Design an enzyme around this catalytic site. Sequence first.
Site, PDB file in Angstrom:
ATOM      1  N   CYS A 197       0.833  -1.217   0.000  1.00  0.00           N
ATOM      2  CA  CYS A 197       0.000   0.000   0.000  1.00  0.00           C
ATOM      3  C   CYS A 197       0.853   1.246   0.000  1.00  0.00           C
ATOM      4  CB  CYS A 197      -0.950  -0.008   1.220  1.00  0.00           C
ATOM      5  SG  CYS A 197      -0.164   0.006   2.818  1.00  0.00           S
ATOM      6  N   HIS A 238      -3.403   1.067   6.612  1.00  0.00           N
ATOM      7  CA  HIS A 238      -2.922   0.994   5.233  1.00  0.00           C
ATOM      8  C   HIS A 238      -2.695   2.409   4.732  1.00  0.00           C
ATOM      9  CE1 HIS A 238      -3.627  -3.268   5.044  1.00  0.00           C
ATOM     10  NE2 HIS A 238      -4.899  -3.113   5.367  1.00  0.00           N
TER      11      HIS A 238
END
Length: 320
Positions: A10, A79
């Site tokens: 991510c 994330h």
Amino acid sequence: DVFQNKANVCWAKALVPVLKTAGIDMTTEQWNTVDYFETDKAHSAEIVLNQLCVRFFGLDLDSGLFSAPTVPLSIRNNHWDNSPSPNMYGLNKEVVRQLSRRYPQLPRAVATGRVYDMNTGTLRNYDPRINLVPVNRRLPHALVLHHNEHPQSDFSSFVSKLKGRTVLVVGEKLSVPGKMVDWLSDRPEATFRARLDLGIPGDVPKYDIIFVNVRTPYKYHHYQQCEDHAIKLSMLTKKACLHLNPGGTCVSIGYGYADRASESIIGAIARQFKFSRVCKPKSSLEETEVLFVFIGYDRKARTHNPYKLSSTLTNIYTGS
């Protein structure tokens, strides 16, 4: 697809628009020179930005090169993404103009995503060996003259001599004679099984001693080894402070704090303890390796003088 077969990058995806402001387009092969990309682990986008900034332009983020608030780097649900937040990055063209007097081809480098070679002033294709240290950073301590490949250091004796009853070993397995040992690792036979790139699980209890028995590979330079270990100091060593009994001890494998992230993280950890020192026991063979030792955990407000640990690190790495 640059991110094919990756579940945990991510941070790399979030960096794409930040890097694009300096003309950078990372290929899969170039991304593979970031350890956590190649091994597919969670990482700080900010630490990786700083790493890439040095590799491409020979300067770290304290140069202000990426200080334009153009693209967010935000964390939602653990994330990284580019959702709006007051944590924004991007090529700062005014800083580029300022730097161009000293570095004439730097504007072309940041226009075209090319490496500015600090030794020659000429432009190169990406290679992580070209710029090994940020030229703008006054390093707080000496780095090692030479690195060699040694077997892993056995710290059993060191940890067994620490004051404390209950030990949590994080990372590799370690026997500690005379003490109670729990083991946190991503192995099936660990007491607590978890992905160590996600940090110490909140469900882990409290201990007298936590030993972070986690290593980072040397590839290009002491600087690189230190910056690659920084995320582990943040996710393990710093988080360990919440799993200590009052007056407890945290010991962690480290490589100093050649990079800005490590320096900040160590400072933040050191402030939560009555005592902090750096040790290199006889068992520690790898030349860059040290133990950070934090003794007497509390939450008393106190300052930390980084010159104390920096003095010791310089002494260790120069044989002084």
